[PDB]
Design a binder for these strands. Structure first.
Length: 274
RNA sequence: AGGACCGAACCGACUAAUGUCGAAAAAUUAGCGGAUGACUUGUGGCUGGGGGUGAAAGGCCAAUCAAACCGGGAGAUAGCU
RNA sequence: AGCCAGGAUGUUGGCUUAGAAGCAGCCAUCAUUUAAAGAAAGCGUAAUAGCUCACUGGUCGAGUCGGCCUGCGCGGAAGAU
RNA sequence: CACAGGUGGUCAGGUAGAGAAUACCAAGGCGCUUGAGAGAACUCGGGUGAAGGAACUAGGCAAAAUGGUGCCGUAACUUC
RNA sequence: AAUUCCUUGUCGGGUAAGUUCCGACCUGCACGAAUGGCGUAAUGAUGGCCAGGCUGUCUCCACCCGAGACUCAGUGAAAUU
RNA sequence: GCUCAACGGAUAAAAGGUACUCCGGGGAUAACAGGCUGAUACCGCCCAAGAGUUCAUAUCGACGGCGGUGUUUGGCACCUCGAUGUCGGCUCAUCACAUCCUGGGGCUGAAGUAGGUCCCAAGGGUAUGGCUGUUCGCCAUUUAAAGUGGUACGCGAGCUGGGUUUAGAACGUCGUGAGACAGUUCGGUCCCUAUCUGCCGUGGGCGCUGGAGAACUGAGGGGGGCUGCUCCUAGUACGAGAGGACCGGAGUGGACGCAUCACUGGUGUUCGGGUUGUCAUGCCAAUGGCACUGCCCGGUAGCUAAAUGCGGAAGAGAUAAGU
RNA sequence: GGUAGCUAAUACCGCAUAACGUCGCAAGACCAAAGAGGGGGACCUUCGGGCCUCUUGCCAUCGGAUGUGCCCAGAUGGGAUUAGCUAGUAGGUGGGGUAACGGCUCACCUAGGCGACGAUCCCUAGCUGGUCUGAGAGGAUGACCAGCCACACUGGAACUGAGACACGGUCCAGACUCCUACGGGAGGCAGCAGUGGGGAAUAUUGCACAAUGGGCGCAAGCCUGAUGCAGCCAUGCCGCGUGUAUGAAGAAGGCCUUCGGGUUGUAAAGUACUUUCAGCGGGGAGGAAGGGAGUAAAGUUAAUACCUUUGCUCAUUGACGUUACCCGCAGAAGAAGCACCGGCUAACUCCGUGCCAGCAGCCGCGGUAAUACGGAGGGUGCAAGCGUUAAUCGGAAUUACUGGGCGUAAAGCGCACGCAGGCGGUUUGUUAAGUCAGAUGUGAAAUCCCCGGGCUCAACCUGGGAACUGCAUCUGAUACUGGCAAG
RNA sequence: CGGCCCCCUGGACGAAGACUGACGCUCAGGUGCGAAAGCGUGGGGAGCAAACAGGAUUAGAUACCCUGGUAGUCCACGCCG
RNA sequence: GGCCGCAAGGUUAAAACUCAAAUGAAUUGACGGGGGCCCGCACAAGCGGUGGAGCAUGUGGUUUAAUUCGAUGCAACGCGAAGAACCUUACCUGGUCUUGACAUCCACGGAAGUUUUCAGAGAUGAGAAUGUGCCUUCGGGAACCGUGAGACAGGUGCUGCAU
RNA sequence: GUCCGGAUUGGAGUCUGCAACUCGACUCCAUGAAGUCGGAAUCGCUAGUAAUCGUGGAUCAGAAUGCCACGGUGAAUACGUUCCCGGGCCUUGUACACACCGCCCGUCACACCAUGGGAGUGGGUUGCAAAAGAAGUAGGUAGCUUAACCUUCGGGAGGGCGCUUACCACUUUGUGAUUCAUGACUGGGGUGAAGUCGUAACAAGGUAACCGUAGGGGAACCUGCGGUUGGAUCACCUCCU
RNA sequence: GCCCGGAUAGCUCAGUCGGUAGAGCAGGGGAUUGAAAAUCCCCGUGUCCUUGGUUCGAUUCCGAGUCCGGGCACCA
């Protein structure tokens, strides 16, 4: 597949191939679906590479919708030679979406040296490792603040990674109590169409959950703007070409990480769990 | 040499067809299995019914067996037809 | 009842102010030219319009419109020699 | 029952054959106590089979097949 | 599994396709150590399964050859009603 | 002086199994089958929340409403216990229509192709295999499609007997035990000559008004009716493009039926030849007999299908839904 | 392709005829051949010729040289978790066959043969001179060149020929391309280039027969992808070069800095100078011996002809090749890298990142002051090269013959007996196998080494010796080992 | 290898003489012996004691410790090596 | 895999892979539920206490705007602190100023100082009055208060595992 | 629960100090708690000591139940080194060396790597037993055809094509041997900064270890029988001539 | 289906015909005696299956309910 797609990208620059870093899927992109159809045909004939054609996996994220306080995590494993003691108490709270470029906030509010300052980075690191694989469906956790304010150590049995284990326990229990939700991307879509073909474009966009922001009547006709989920923005090239008799051109860009509609989010949560 | 091997006589009786008011109240035609052996067989006796005999099925004891057959109790009984 | 006419400016009114425009929708849901227009019945609009009707004029020029109580019928009603 | 059944021992030939098998005959004895026509279906004891070769079926049941002496050759496992 | 109900369990081998067959996993409804457990060369008119030879078993049946059926003359039943 | 507690108390004293079974009875009473009924099952319809971007009614249709059929699991015990052979398969069917295909249309969220849904329609047609006892089901490959059901869950005086259903046995389990188990495993008698309805055929008598030999008319009745692909129409109508036709025409095939033997083959124990064992013809030579025609190699006429001709129409009339 | 006629020859076939040829005890028997060219006196011309003379070929025989075939011995990988193997197999006689011998092949008889110093089977593999290594002994390995062997799309066979069981020949079957009129054909780069592929990776679809070598020819000659040269590639070795000389404020700028200075460092500019080599333009050996016309002489002959043999002169024979080589000119101009700098190991510090990013051959460095991780100055090695990786030997006396071990570090079988195998007291004699000595034969040349020479030197090329450590023979020597005999 | 006794029997050693005359050393393969525990058959079984049971102990103690206790230890013949 | 064995198993006998060591003797220590010996309120023999009570004080913990910070087996916990009402004070809220409260240097202006008033929680702000001394080159300088300049000053900020 | 105890709370004060609200000391009047000798455990002290009684100081404006000093009164016991704690010397064992708070073993859980077995599956190479017979030779030849040699000169001799036989290539079938690959599952081995359950070895490692065998058991191991030292300890006390 | 029975600390029961519960183990302040352990001296952890009523004045009685399990559901 890699070899075949490389040859096709070399002869046709308008054809792009990348691996999506999140899904690990090979994504192919082209100047229309009939274009991609010919590319796929050549790949599975000239090179004869057996492949399935699907849709770019929507980048699902994870977050909470409820502050939880006083979440205890106590890794107390005093067994097997010497013990490993670690004890942390954290508050977990949602951030506003995109309010932090890091998607994560850590507040150290330890008072009284209940935790030695040397173990605080190991607690933060234990949380940050758990943010990579969320407790709901195993997607990355975003838009969340954690305040470490209470904890305890043992002079002989306390370890850096023991406090990291305690942090993970506290996080997993807190996250389940915090009403966890599955997130979604939304794509800003712009469609240029003749004025007489305008109507059809939006009829289909409405079925594709496209929140029409507005329109900019241009010389060709109308420049309609809509917020459409990535999931519903697939196969649009040929669909538009059908509604507009082949005189329409759209563009799309990633807008923001909004909340997936309860129905959509829950359906995927169940499917992932299965 | 062998409860040895292949196969007739003799002894058995797996399979299919027939015949099933039959040729015959269990056999015939076509293969089968055993065949010096815990082999088969003629003639003469011994065990008698709640008992015999049984490489053991309630199988056999005169086409009669979870208790024969044949006289007598006895014109058993029968709230059943 | 038809056959010829018209069937508005405020008002793209706003709430979401994206505009939600007389026609997805709580809200004026009036005063006027008036015969009037509900400040829109109804299709048509991504979102207006569009084409029409409520209302009114002329016409030909008679009865006519809508429920209730009862008779009798019509449909609903397709099965195996 | 003038019944395609059962009944112990002796004698036991020629040619082919390992042979009392089996095949044709010898000595001897018999045609089986109902016959004559036609030459449909169908039932029975048998023969041949185009191309395909278990696709039939409960299931290779039945049928076809293999089939003799000499010599060459002979696997896993095995209590050798 | 001659033992497993569920259950055609699940995975692999075999076939175009395999509730049976073969080898395993172990969640043994409800295996088990002389009411013996587990293997085991050889043997078996023993159950299951596959490949081959070869064939009218079959797809789909045709023609031939003898004994009955049909007819001619003689003898002449039976179950049942 | 009795929990004689089965309380009108059969004894002072009493528990099972039978598929090894037996007798006497019963449709007084079950299983299989029919009948009445129709909860359930199946198909249809009523109200229309809401879904369907918008919009109840293109397509689904909640919560609730009303009926039809006699199709499954049942209720009843009406027929049969002096016997109704009781599942599945084979062979053979035949009606019903609530229709899987081919035919005719209406709406579409019907561009075209292809489909979604409902109405009219019973003329014909409606696979072959692995596994299983399987109806069923899953799978593989086809197909114009592999319809849903009455018919004693059609059909055993037609067939098989694998399953359930006798006696042998064995495993697990339940019992002290005999023995039990819609729990399992291996084995395991299917009987009849057709009297009378019925039915496929073929004849005798009389009759039909004098007798006889021919030819037809034709009241009435059966058989028959299916369809694919390819080309042309045209890569046209339609459509962004991809794709892609109705209406009409030609040809060429599969399943099924009809007739025939000219062609390609089968058979062809009555025709020719080869040959093994043996006997006879007096012997040699040559022939004849018997061994499944002895075993085989060919094959004329007939009979045959795998072979080869032909079919199923058009047209017309009156109509269904609809226009 | 087919048919029917015609024509030549050093093509083909009988005879004559032989020997020191073949066979056979002999006697006998029997065998073969081919002719062409130049010139000419008389002769003679059927007017070609005959005839003489010269040059070469043929046939037969005995030799020599070259080449080829066959045989014996010894050496020539790994494996015993391969121990038995074989029936033309071992041999004999007889027949056949081959250039010959031979189980090369048949017929019969005998029952052999091989094998623990390794038969049989399996795996691997072209062998050698040699090459790389090593102080040697050894270990690795067969690039290059040269000798031998094997193969020529795969399998098998033969023909022709002195010689193939045949790279650019034939026939058959197989697979794979190509043409076709569908009937049948055609083809084989492991020759030179070239292409696609495969791969980490290996070159131009060049020119010329000028010499050497080959083939044919009496010669001239033509062919020769042998060869002689050239293109492309640092792949390697060797050589030369990007100047040399002066010149301190010890400049600027760079970094270090106790910030005093140090360093880059005579390094630069400048100035004084030269022109190796690419540049430009000219001169310009040698690789060439020959051969040919002419000439003249000597042979040769009947003949000065012709031909043989020796000199003279003339015109000439170079793909390389705008040759090297030499001479002149203009301009500092056209010409320097790469690795490393913790330790082993030559060469040190500053800055950022902090068990993160990583580095590394080994030990190890990195957790907030990193000579080790990246930049900068500086240094060091090497140099048109420099690093890594792979690969062999060395170091490794870690397979120990030279040249090691086994009381406890790895290692004495549990112990014994014993066949084969290995080793053996002492005295004398003999032989002379081992061993030692001398000589001959060979041990190809190249390559290594030595002393020399020739390309400006070097690499490269060459002369002689040395070596080839070996085996075989002959003559010896006889201590020692062995064999034999008496002790 | 251990009471004592008998019978059969190996090997070593010492002294003074005699004899044979190197008849020698070592040993791959080969053959023989080879504690204890196991295994086979048939006996024997006091003691002792794997397994096993009970009591304690212990956090648990399927161990030490306690009480029992089968194989086994014993003999004849083999095997194992 | 072969051979042997009734079996247990024996005998013969590898390779992938992985590590940079594994091992031997001896040495100094350390440690021994090893031996000898020996010492101390270590024990034995005694007296009086803590742990229960209430209070003082320190710490842990939790609370809080902060509850400053360090000590935290013996060898921290009436410890740094031989003394926290403000001060101390490093902590907290709020109000403030920046070459600065503390030093050296520069340029200017004013003796320095003193008294007193308002505004302000205070820091400060605005003043209002008065004083006007010392050495003289008096164009002075510097004891001293302010304003501007850049050097710098400040840090109870971190690291006792740099010292 | 007292004329014991004096914690607590109300009012009344005095002083220090700018200042006593959090947050000072002391006086007065009133109020009068828990507590009736202290669980498990554990601390001090060998003579002017333990115990009790009171004074002064330093810090400081004020602010001791603490610290630092001072005198008063003034005990009990110590046979003794067996035992714990710590230490010193000598000898011994050791697998310990940021040194017994040391080392370190094997189940079990997860990921990974390479292998053994595995119903089998697909290749390679090859043995055997046979079948097969192109082309080419070699042997035979009923048949057709034929220049040069010969001929009684008719035709012979001899050859060629053709037929056939022997050898043998492709090719086929059957059955073995060996090797490469793969196979659900499965046995063990290795590796993996900080897993779970014990703690088997190293000291007499707390039952001396280890070897062979046998049995058992979640592990390490434990028990029997034999063997070895690659095992320490042999000193004190009672007694005796 | 039929029948029976139960549900009590996190777990399991003790216990009950009577409104208001015991133990360990998981959990313990303090023990243990470098440290912890072990967990030792001693302590707790429930609403005793729940309600609704009846009333030894309900988990209990009685029914309901909620759930699970057990034995039992065949014969033609």
């Amino acid at each position: 597949m890699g070899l075949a797609l490389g040859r096709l990208a070399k002869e046709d620059p308008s054809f792009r191939v990348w691996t999506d870093e999140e899904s690990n899927q090979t994504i192919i992109a082209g100047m229309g679906e009939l274009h991609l159809d010919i590319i796929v045909d050549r790949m599975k004939r000239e090179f004869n590479v057996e492949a399935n054609v699907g849709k770019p996996q929507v980048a699902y994220r994870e977050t909470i919708r409820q502050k939880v306080t006083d979440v205890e995590g106590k890794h107390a494993k005093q067994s097997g030679g010497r013990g490993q003691y670690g004890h942390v108490v954290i508050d977990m709270y949602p951030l506003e979406p995109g309010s932090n470029p890091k998607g994560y906030e850590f507040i150290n509010d330890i008072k009284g040296g209940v935790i030695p300052g040397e173990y605080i980075p190991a607690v933060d690191k234990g949380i940050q490792e758990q943010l990579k694989a969320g407790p709901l469906a195993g997607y990355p956790v975003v838009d969340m603040g954690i305040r470490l304010h209470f904890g305890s150590y043992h002079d002989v049995d306390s370890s850096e990674l023991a406090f990291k284990l305690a942090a993970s326990i506290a996080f997993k229990e807190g996250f389940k109590k915090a009403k966890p939700v599955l997130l979604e991307p939304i794509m800003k879509v712009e469609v240029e169409t003749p004025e007489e073909n305008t109507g059809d474009v939006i009829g289909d966009l409405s079925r594709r959950r496209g929140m029409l922001k507005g329109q900019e009547s241009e010389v060709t006709g109308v420049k309609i703007h809509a917020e459409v989920p990535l999931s519903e923005m697939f196969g649009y090239a040929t669909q538009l070409r059908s509604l507009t008799k082949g005189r329409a051109s759209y563009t799309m860009e990633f807008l923001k990480y909004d909340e997936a509609p309860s129905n959509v989010a829950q359906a995927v949560i169940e499917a992932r769990g299965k």
